[PDB]
Write an enzyme that holds these catalytic residues in place. Structure first.
Site, PDB file in Angstrom:
ATOM      1  N   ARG A  82      55.782  27.765  75.296  1.00 18.93           N
ATOM      2  CA  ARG A  82      55.008  28.972  75.076  1.00 18.93           C
ATOM      3  C   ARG A  82      54.239  29.346  76.320  1.00 18.93           C
ATOM      4  O   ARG A  82      53.763  28.485  77.055  1.00 18.93           O
ATOM      5  CB  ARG A  82      54.083  28.799  73.880  1.00 18.93           C
ATOM      6  CG  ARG A  82      54.837  28.254  72.680  1.00 18.93           C
ATOM      7  CD  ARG A  82      53.999  28.246  71.440  1.00 18.93           C
ATOM      8  NE  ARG A  82      54.463  27.231  70.498  1.00 18.93           N
ATOM      9  CZ  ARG A  82      53.763  26.850  69.437  1.00 18.93           C
ATOM     10  NH1 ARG A  82      52.592  27.421  69.206  1.00 18.93           N
ATOM     11  NH2 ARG A  82      54.221  25.913  68.616  1.00 18.93           N
ATOM     12  N   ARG A  92      57.132  30.615  70.815  1.00 13.42           N
ATOM     13  CA  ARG A  92      58.123  29.831  71.542  1.00 13.42           C
ATOM     14  C   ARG A  92      59.199  30.731  72.135  1.00 13.42           C
ATOM     15  O   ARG A  92      59.826  31.517  71.424  1.00 13.42           O
ATOM     16  CB  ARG A  92      58.774  28.785  70.640  1.00 13.42           C
ATOM     17  CG  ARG A  92      59.793  27.934  71.381  1.00 13.42           C
ATOM     18  CD  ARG A  92      60.355  26.821  70.517  1.00 13.42           C
ATOM     19  NE  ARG A  92      61.179  27.318  69.420  1.00 13.42           N
ATOM     20  CZ  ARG A  92      62.510  27.305  69.426  1.00 13.42           C
ATOM     21  NH1 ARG A  92      63.166  26.828  70.475  1.00 13.42           N
ATOM     22  NH2 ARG A  92      63.185  27.768  68.384  1.00 13.42           N
ATOM     23  N   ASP A  95      64.197  27.349  74.336  1.00 18.38           N
ATOM     24  CA  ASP A  95      65.019  26.627  73.384  1.00 18.38           C
ATOM     25  C   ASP A  95      65.858  25.551  74.067  1.00 18.38           C
ATOM     26  O   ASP A  95      66.647  25.848  74.977  1.00 18.38           O
ATOM     27  CB  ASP A  95      65.921  27.607  72.634  1.00 18.38           C
ATOM     28  CG  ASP A  95      66.668  26.959  71.511  1.00 18.38           C
ATOM     29  OD1 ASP A  95      66.029  26.255  70.709  1.00 18.38           O
ATOM     30  OD2 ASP A  95      67.901  27.158  71.426  1.00 18.38           O
ATOM     31  N   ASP A  97      68.590  22.758  73.087  1.00 20.73           N
ATOM     32  CA  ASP A  97      69.499  22.246  72.062  1.00 20.73           C
ATOM     33  C   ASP A  97      70.425  21.184  72.636  1.00 20.73           C
ATOM     34  O   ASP A  97      70.895  21.304  73.770  1.00 20.73           O
ATOM     35  CB  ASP A  97      70.360  23.369  71.492  1.00 20.73           C
ATOM     36  CG  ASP A  97      69.573  24.346  70.667  1.00 20.73           C
ATOM     37  OD1 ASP A  97      68.371  24.120  70.447  1.00 20.73           O
ATOM     38  OD2 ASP A  97      70.162  25.349  70.235  1.00 20.73           O
TER      39      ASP A  97
END
Ligand SMILES: Nc1ncnc2c1ncn2[C@@H]1O[C@H](COP(=O)(O)CP(=O)(O)OP(=O)(O)O)[C@@H](O)[C@H]1O
Ligand SMILES: [Cl-]
Ligand SMILES: [Mg+2]
Ligand SMILES: [Mg+2]
Length: 158
Positions: A82, A92, A95, A97
């Site tokens: 953030r 947010r 990301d 993953d």
């Protein structure tokens, strides 16, 4: 074990956030970055109001267990995900993953690996193909095969 991590940011000017995240990935215990893909641009979803998405792929050598790695990527999202605006912290925008974790198949409450939707996403497949053109999935599908079959448009570099 070689883990492949997808990085995405939809901040208007995402380079500093992405670099902060990359540095943090390299600081994860029992791990180190092997290679980082170029940064790829994808237009926003639906409404044109949103900023473009910066997408990339990182190859991380790690001796951590998969869920231990997830703890760290999730920590990094909490710590660097953030950005402070004038008088408020934004939502947010980062990301992280886990696309693949060695040749492992994972299906737990916390983890689905290979990432459940990666075969549909040029934003994941193109940067991964750049850094691992000969990659084979756990079930024997080849990355090259997925790209050849779908014939996704190529993405512009950032
Ligand atoms: N391969 C993986 N990598 C990261 N998180 C994963 C994951 N498989 C499952 N998850 C789970 O995904 C949950 C939601 O994560 P989010 O980051 O909010 C989804 P997202 O990445 O915004 O969308 P996406 O999964 O469509 O890419 C997490 O709580 C985490 O446990
Ligand atoms: Cl380009
Ligand atoms: Mg995601
Ligand atoms: Mg995520």
């Amino acid at each position: 074990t070689v883990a492949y991590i997808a990085i995405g940011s939809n901040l208007a000017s995402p380079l500093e956030q992405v670099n902060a995240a990359l540095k943090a990935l390299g600081d994860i215990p029992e791990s180190h970055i092997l290679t980082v893909s170029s940064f790829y641009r994808t237009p926003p979803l639906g409404p044109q109001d949103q900023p473009d998405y910066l997408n990339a792929a990182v190859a991380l050598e790690t001796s951590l267990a998969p869920e231990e790695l997830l703890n760290h990527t999730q920590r990094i999202e909490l710590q660097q995900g953030r950005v402070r605006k004038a008088e408020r912290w934004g939502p947010r925008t980062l990301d992280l993953d886990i696309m693949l974790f060695g040749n492992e198949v994972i299906n737990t409450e916390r983890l689905t690996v290979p990432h459940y939707d990666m075969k549909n996403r040029g934003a994941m497949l193109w940067p991964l193909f750049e850094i691992a053109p000969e990659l084979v999935f756990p079930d024997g599908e080849m990355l090259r095969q997925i790209l050849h079959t779908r014939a996704f448009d190529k993405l512009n570099k950032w």
